[PDB]
Amino acid sequence: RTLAVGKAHLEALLATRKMTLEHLQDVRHDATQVYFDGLEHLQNVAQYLAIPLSEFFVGQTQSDLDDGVKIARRNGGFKREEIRGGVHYYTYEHLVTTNQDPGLMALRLDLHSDDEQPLRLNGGHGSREIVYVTRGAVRVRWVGDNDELKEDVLNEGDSIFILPNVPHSFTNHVGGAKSEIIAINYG
Amino acid sequence: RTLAVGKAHLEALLATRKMTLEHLQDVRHDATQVYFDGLEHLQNVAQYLAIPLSEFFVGQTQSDLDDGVKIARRNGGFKREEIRGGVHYYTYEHLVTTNQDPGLMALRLDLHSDDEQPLRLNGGHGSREIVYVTRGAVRVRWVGDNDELKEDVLNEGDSIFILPNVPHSFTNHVGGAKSEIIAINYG
Amino acid sequence: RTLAVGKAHLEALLATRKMTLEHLQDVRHDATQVYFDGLEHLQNVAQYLAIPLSEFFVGQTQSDLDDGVKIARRNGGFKREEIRGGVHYYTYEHLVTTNQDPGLMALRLDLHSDDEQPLRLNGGHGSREIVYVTRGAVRVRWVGDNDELKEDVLNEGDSIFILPNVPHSFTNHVGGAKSEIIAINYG
Amino acid sequence: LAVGKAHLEALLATRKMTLERHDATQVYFDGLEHLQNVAQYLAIPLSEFFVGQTQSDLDDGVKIARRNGGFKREEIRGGVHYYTYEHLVTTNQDPGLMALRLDLHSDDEQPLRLNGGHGSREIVYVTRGAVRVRWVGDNDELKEDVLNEGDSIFILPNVPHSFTNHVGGAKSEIIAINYG
Ligand SMILES: C[C@@H](O)CP(=O)(O)O
Ligand SMILES: C[C@@H](O)CP(=O)(O)O
Ligand SMILES: C[C@@H](O)CP(=O)(O)O
Ligand SMILES: [Mn+2]
Ligand SMILES: [Mn+2]
Ligand SMILES: [Mn+2]
């Protein structure tokens, strides 16, 4: 019908440009919200103010925290198996996620496939990563300096930090011994 | 009424959560963009992905630079008078502004007030500031340590740096002798 | 006593100030380093360049990563007991830490307190936090909206995100104490 | 070698440690690079130990500089007198800010001498005269324009560029502010 943005927030954006609401042609408002014909109209104002569109929605989505915190339950959220050409590779389970840090992706992974399983590196991630081995023994492989493959074995209680965009893979060291890790991507 | 989100961007957000476009119920798309019925539909997806609405437009604004640069012309952009409690204080003129740094607000100001008029401090602001005097003699007043008023006179070629949230005011030292400054707010 | 600063780095700093090494009094150098008589001499140059002393060492710490990565082993690093007002609260064990992200503090904690002991909240901290329960049942208490105490129980596989500066405490839900958590502080 | 106690305690707290010499306000390191060892042990870079410990050069939230009051020099690039560089206010509260006033001395009769670009963003404003600006654009192609009094330009990091007089013999002036 109409696209709403928070008045106070929009007024602060205008103030960084030394403007007020009067400097916007023909928008309507009420006590708390400013109304736009649609995204296209909003884009035009954004262009005029030389602010990117994203800024106009910052802080508009309601926090999903309760009292400064958010709780998630085992087996409670998103989960799926990862199966590639008939080979069961991972179980991916979301741990707590929040709209107060969309850059945080915390996972619990079951590692299902073995030694006769082929290498399938990722392309690396913009996020930093720390991984901790909750159970079993885990083969970690990654692409090091001068694009050379490296490897090591992480046992229960070991951990690893991985810089952005380093390509890497986690598999069971033994096979038939299913291992588990927690992987936290951030920043 | 329809809302467009960049497909590649949205696909990257979904991939960090180990999802694909198939995991979104009733969206349509084309080669480059994903379409939502309206804000209400978008808010649902945001909820489902536990991301704020702003994230869907992050990075997606087209640069307003041409070849790494952007040029602005005297009197070419926004301008207005600033009147504070009945006293004509400034003329604000925008210098170059760019969506590649929405936090940069560079201004040319004419000064209109003086000692015959009452002081009208601002409340300070988040941005750092450097000011340079292009013409005339400028009385600067600000709130210092222990909330005490301070003052000095800046002549042509002098400059001043102001820490965030220090309240301040620039007026003509002589009065009827109209002065000019450049103010650059950043960060 | 003979303080060394990286030459290339110092040259870049000088270049931002439109200076060269010739504009520094009384420093000697070699191919890779610039030498100062002492802190007193360095503090003078810092004053002259209007930079803080810290800047002279920014980026100059050698990375502790090997090939983009760093590995730590269970029981391989720092640990200590935490006793708060006479109550044995935690065992803190460092997981991997790196000088490439000093804001990342990943810990494994043993929990030693319960309800038969008094509450000992921390003061909160600047870092975001995600915690995951590896073993047992964990009472989590925190200070919520309007400074009211809140509580919940986290079981094995549950996780929790805590916003910066929210004061909080983790104890065993069941008296007779040994639950375990992984706590990752970041950003 | 002295470090602020409060600051060091906060650093130790991020590693779940405490002071495991000092006085009320400061902590002392004997080896002078005894400090590098502790930094290594905490896996914090050395620089962090001095953050916030240089005394502010502001007076009451502000810092004032005067024309001709600070650093100044001539810039001669290939036997060609190119700029006069004059520092405007500089502060240790933002070591990333370099604000300059430049007199321009070269023109089209003299060869082009681009810089290599730099890490800072830049905004420039023309206080006097007419200024020829040349820069390296997309696909490493040269571009040019003329900026008159009151015009301004924003330059992305690492774009190589040059400012000269458009007319020549007609000496122009700019203010250049580098930040972030
Ligand atoms: C010129 C500028 O510093 C005054 P204000 O716009 O912040 O009040
Ligand atoms: C486990 C962690 O949240 C406790 P602390 O950081 O308050 O010591
Ligand atoms: C005005 C200034 O940008 C010229 P350069 O000193 O960076 O080459
Ligand atoms: Mn201001
Ligand atoms: Mn904590
Ligand atoms: Mn420059």
**3-class DSSP string for chain C:** CCEEEEHHHHHHHHHHCCCCHHHCCCCEECCCEEEECCHHHHHHHHHHCCCCHHHHHCCCCCCCCCCCEEEECCCCCCEEEEEECCEEEEEEEECCCCCCCCCCEEEEEEECCCCCCCCCCCCCCCCEEEEEEEECEEEEEEECHHHCEEEEEEECCCEEEECCCCCEEEEECCCCCCEEEEEEEEC
Neighbours of A5 (CB within 10 A): 19
* Binding pocket residue ranges, ligand 1, CB within 6 Å: B 109, 122, 125, 129, 131, 170, 183
Q: To test ligand 2's pocket by mutation, which of C170, C180, C182, C186 has the most ligand atoms within 8 angstroms of CB?
A: C170
- Contact: D71, C46; criterion CB under 8 Å: no
Half-sphere exposure of C37 (CA within 13 A, CB side): 9
Work out the minimum CA distance from B168 to partner chain D, whole angstroms.
10
Question: Which residues are within 8 A (CB) of A109 and not within 5 positions of it... i.e. 6 or more apart?
Answer: A90, A91, A92, A93, A170, A180, A181, A182, A183
SS3 A7: helix
In the sheet that A33-36 helps form, which strands lie side by side, from edge to edge? Answer: A3-6, A33-36, A28-29
DSSP state of D167: S
Output the CA angle A47-B62-B24, nearest 5 degrees. 105
Assign B148 to helix, strand or coil: coil
Q: Backbone breaks in chain C (C–N > 2.5 Å) follow which residues? A: none
| Cα–Cα distance measured from residue A34 to residue B79, given in angstroms and rounded to the nearest whole number | 23
How many Cβ atoms are within 10 Å of B1's Cβ, its own excluded? 13
d(CA A160, CA A170): 11
Burial category of A171 from C-beta neighbours within 10 Å (exposed 0-12, middle 13-18, buried 19 and up): buried
Triad D41, D43, D47: Cα angle to 5°: 105
Q: Sheet harboring D142-148: ordered strands across?
A: D142-148, D130-136, D161-165
Among D129, D50, D175, which Cα is nearest to C51's?
D50
What are phi and psi for residue A46, nearest 5 degrees? -50, -40
Chain D CB contacts of C55 under 8 Å are 47, 95
Cβ atoms of D89 and D99 closer than 8 Å: yes
Query: Chains A vs B: touching, with 3+ CB pairs under 8 Å?
Result: yes
Give the Cα separation of D64 and D57 in Å (integer).
10
* Residue B64 CA, distance from chain mean position: 15
**What CA–CA distance (Å, rounded) separates D37 from B94?**
51
Whether A80 and B18 lie within 8 Å, measured CB to CB: yes
Q: What is the largest CA-CA distance in chain B?
A: 70
CB burial readout D67-92, b (16+ within 10 A) else e: beeebeeebebeebebbbbbbbbbbb
Say which of B159, B161, B186 has its CB closest to residue D180: B186
Query: D58, B159: Cβ pair inside 8 Å?
Result: no
C122 CB under 6 A from ligand 2? yes
Return the structure tokens found at B136: 């005339």
Residue nearest to atom 4 of ligand 2 (CA): C169
A98–B18 C-beta distance less than 8 A: no
Residue D147, ligand 3, Cβ within 6 A: no
**CB burial readout B149-166, b (16+ within 10 A) else e:** ebeeebebbbbbbbbeeb
- Report chain B residues whose CB lies below 8 A from the CB of A97: 17, 50
Q: Which two tokens stand for residue C141?
A: 């208490």
Residue D139 to residue C76: CA distance in whole angstroms: 51
Please report, for residues B136, C10, D72, D85, the alpha-carbon distance to residue C15 in angstroms, rounded to integers and kept in the order given. 32, 9, 14, 12
To the question of whether residue D158 is assigned a binding role by annotation, the answer is no
Q: Do chains D and A touch (3 or more CB pairs under 8 A)?
A: no
Determine if residue A84 is labeled as part of a ligand binding site: yes
Which method resolved this structure? Answer: X-ray
In D35-141, at which residue ranges do the beta strands (DSSP E only) sit?
Answer: 62-65, 72-76, 81-87, 98-104, 121-128, 130-136
**Does the CA dihedral D15-C74-A96-C120 come out positive or negative?**
negative
How far is it, in rounded angstroms, from Cα B173 to Cα B180? 12
How many A from CA of C27 to the centre of ligand 6? Answer: 27
| Gap between the Cα atoms of D133 and C76, Å rounded | 59
Provide the token pair at D83: 């700029």
Q: How far apart are the first and last CA of chain B?
A: 35
Plot region of A11 (φ>0 → left; ψ -120 to 50 → alpha; else → beta) = alpha
Do residues A124 and A166 make contact, with C-beta atoms less than 8 angstroms apart?
A: yes
Q: Is C60 close to D46, i.e. CB distance below 8 A?
A: yes
Of D102, D15, C182, C9, residue with least CA distance to A159: C182
Instruction: Find the largest Cα–Cα distance for chain A.
Output: 69
Q: What count of other Cβ atoms lies within 10 Å of the Cβ of residue A176?
A: 7
Structure tokens at B24: 């979104």
Tokens, residue A104: 């945080």
C101 neighbors A161 (Cβ within 8 angstroms): yes
Grouping H, G, I as helix, E, B as strand and the rest as coil, residue A16 is helix
Q: Do C106 and A130 touch (CB under 8 A)?
A: yes
CB pairs under 8 A, 24+ apart, for C44-47? Answer: C46/D54, C46/D92, C47/D57, C47/D92
Residues in chain A: 187
Name which of A74, A96, A156 is nearest C130 (Cβ-Cβ): A96
User: For ligand 1, what atom is nearest to the CA of residue B181?
Assistant: 1
Q: Which of residues 115-154 of B touch D (CB under 8 A)?
A: 128, 130, 132, 134, 142-145, 148, 150, 152, 154
The distance of Cα D156 from the centroid of its chain, to the nearest Å, equals: 15
Q: How far is A64 from A101, CA to CA, in rounded Å? A: 10
Backbone phi, then psi, for D148, in 5-degree steps?
A: -100, 175
Please name each of the domains of chain C with its CATH number. 1-65 (no CATH), 66-187 (2.60.120.10)
Q: Is the four-CA dihedral D50, D56, D57, D61 of positive or negative sign?
A: positive
Angstrom distances, CA of residue D5 to CA of D21, D27, D141: 11, 5, 54
Could you please report the per-residue DSSP string of A86-137? TEEEEEEEE----TT-TT-EEEEEEE---SSSPP------SSEEEEEEEESE
Whether A95 contacts C157, CB under 8 Å: no
Centre of ligand 1 to C-alpha D155, Å, is 24
Nearest residue to D98 (alpha-carbon basis) of D109, D114, D110, D86: D86
Q: Looking at ligand 3, which atom is closest to the CA of residue D176?
A: 1
**How many beta-carbon pairs under 8 angstroms link C with D?**
101
Residue D122 alpha carbon, nearest atom of ligand 3? 3
Q: Do C161 and A73 touch (CB under 8 A)?
A: no
Q: Which residues of A touch C73 (CB under 8 A)?
A: 155, 157-158
Nearest to A109 by CA among A138, A150, A87: A138
The span from the first CA to the last CA of chain D, in angstroms, equals: 31
Cα dihedral B145, B150, B152, B158, rounded to 10, equals 40
Sheet containing strand B180-186, strands side by side? B79-84, B87-94, B105-111, B180-186, B128-135, B159-162, D62-65
Closest listed ligand to the CA of D100:
3
- Does residue A72 contact residue C159 with C-beta atoms inside 8 Å? yes
Q: Are D164 and D106 in contact (CB under 8 A)?
A: yes
Flag whether C41 is marked binding.
Answer: no
Chains that touch C (3 or more CB pairs under 8 A): A, D
Q: Is the CB of C109 under 6 A from ligand 2?
A: yes
With an 8 Å Cβ cutoff, are D32 and C1 in contact? yes
* Cβ(C47)–Cβ(C25) below 8 Å: no
C-alpha A151/C-alpha A141 separation (Å) is 4
Q: Where are the alpha helices (DSSP H) in chain A?
A: 7-16, 39-49
Q: If you write DSSP's letter for every residue of D89-119 in order, what string do you get?
A: ---TT-TT-EEEEEEE---TTS--------S
CA atoms within 13 A on the CB side of C154: 31
Residue A65's identity, in one-letter code, is L
Q: Looking at ligand 2, which residue's alpha carbon is closest to its atom 1?
A: C183
Q: Please indicate if the annotation marks B129 as binding a ligand.
A: yes
> Under DSSP, is residue A179 helix (H, G, I), strand (E, B) or coil?
strand
Residue written as tokens 């360049």? C49
- Looking up tokens 């681009």 gives D114
State the Rg of chain C over Cα.
Answer: 24
